[PDB]
């Protein structure tokens, strides 16, 4: 409850309350293409998602989340660096105050427009997401960079749903959707060990960053920036931005599947 992205409660302050903010495995990071290591053990990533597991869309104040039923292995991520399957639970986005600079990861110092996160938990090892959330191997998140350009029709269903969750705490059913439809055509990737990018900031995530970006238009971004942080009835406070600055690598290696 004690955090946001404003001057006063934002990324530069989270350490006062969450000391792990200055940990050794924080995200996001800049990926320096000259220093990535080709690892020949990486397998191609394989996603297999069942659209019937799509459950609901909810406004959480600082962002919006699309959540999936995760009671079984109907929707999983396999391959890449992993030996176990990972069970899909959520996707959400990060954006900025301008359309040109709003991603969380950078590549060779270049910030993209926005970023899609597709989050999965380790059902092989832990009995629920709450348990898994704090363990070093607990989470697998796919990040896809979004470049302002031509409008992306694959986003329409998510954009149309925002109408029903304009204020904090609102939620709506969201069904029959396969988020693999949002990924790029090729799944060549970089990977590194890191963290959730906002409080509680656990160092529990294995990142998969796709090499290829996806498009998005300015207008599409502006719809995100139109959601409200306040509860219904209150004065309006736009969800203007939600990206954390990049964090020191601190000795970590970014591996490439290519
Ligand atoms: Zn995220």
Swiss-Prot record:
This is Carbonic anhydrase 1. Its EC number is 4.2.1.1, 4.2.1.69. Pfam families: Carb_anhydrase. Its main location: cytoplasm. One of its GO terms (cellular component) is cytoplasm. Residues 1-28, 238-258 are annotated as: Disordered. Catalyzes the reversible hydration of carbon dioxide. Can hydrate cyanamide to urea. GO terms for molecular function: arylesterase activity; carbonate dehydratase activity; cyanamide hydratase activity; hydro-lyase activity; zinc ion binding. It catalyses: hydrogencarbonate + H(+) = CO2 + H2O; urea = cyanamide + H2O. InterPro entries: CA_dom, CA_dom_sf, Carbonic_anhydrase_a-class, Carbonic_anhydrase_a-class_CS. Belongs to the alpha-carbonic anhydrase family. Its cofactor is Zn(2+).
């Amino acid at each position: 409850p004690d955090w946001g992205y404003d001057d006063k409660n934002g990324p530069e302050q989270w350490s006062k309350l969450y000391p792990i903010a200055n940990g050794n495995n924080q995200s996001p990071v800049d990926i320096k293409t000259s220093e990535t290591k080709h690892d020949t053990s990486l397998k191609p990533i394989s996603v297999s998602y069942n659209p019937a597991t799509a459950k609901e869309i909810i406004n959480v104040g600082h962002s919006f989340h699309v959540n999936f039923e995760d009671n079984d292995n109907r929707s999983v991520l396999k391959g890449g660096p992993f030996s176990d399957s990972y069970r899909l639970f959520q996707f959400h986005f990060h954006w900025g105050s301008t359309n040109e600079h709003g991603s969380e990861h950078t590549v060779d110092g270049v910030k993209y427009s926005a970023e899609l996160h597709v989050a999965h938990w380790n059902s092989a090892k832990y009995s629920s997401l709450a348990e898994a959330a704090s363990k070093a191997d607990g989470l697998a998140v796919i990040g896809v960079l979004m470049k302002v350009g031509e409008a992306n029709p694959k986003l329409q269903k998510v954009l149309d749903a925002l109408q029903a969750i304009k204020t904090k705490g609102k939620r709506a059913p969201f069904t029959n959707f396969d988020p693999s439809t949002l990924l790029p055509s090729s799944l060549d990737f970089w990977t590194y060990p890191g963290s959730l990018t906002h409080p509680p900031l656990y160092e529990s995530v294995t990142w998969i960053i796709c090499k290829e970006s996806i498009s998005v238009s300015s207008e599409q971004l502006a719809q995100f920036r139109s959601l409200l942080s306040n509860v219904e009835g209150d004065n309006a406070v736009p969800m203007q931005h939600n990206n954390r600055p990049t964090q020191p690598l601190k000795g970590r290696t970014v591996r490439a599947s290519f």
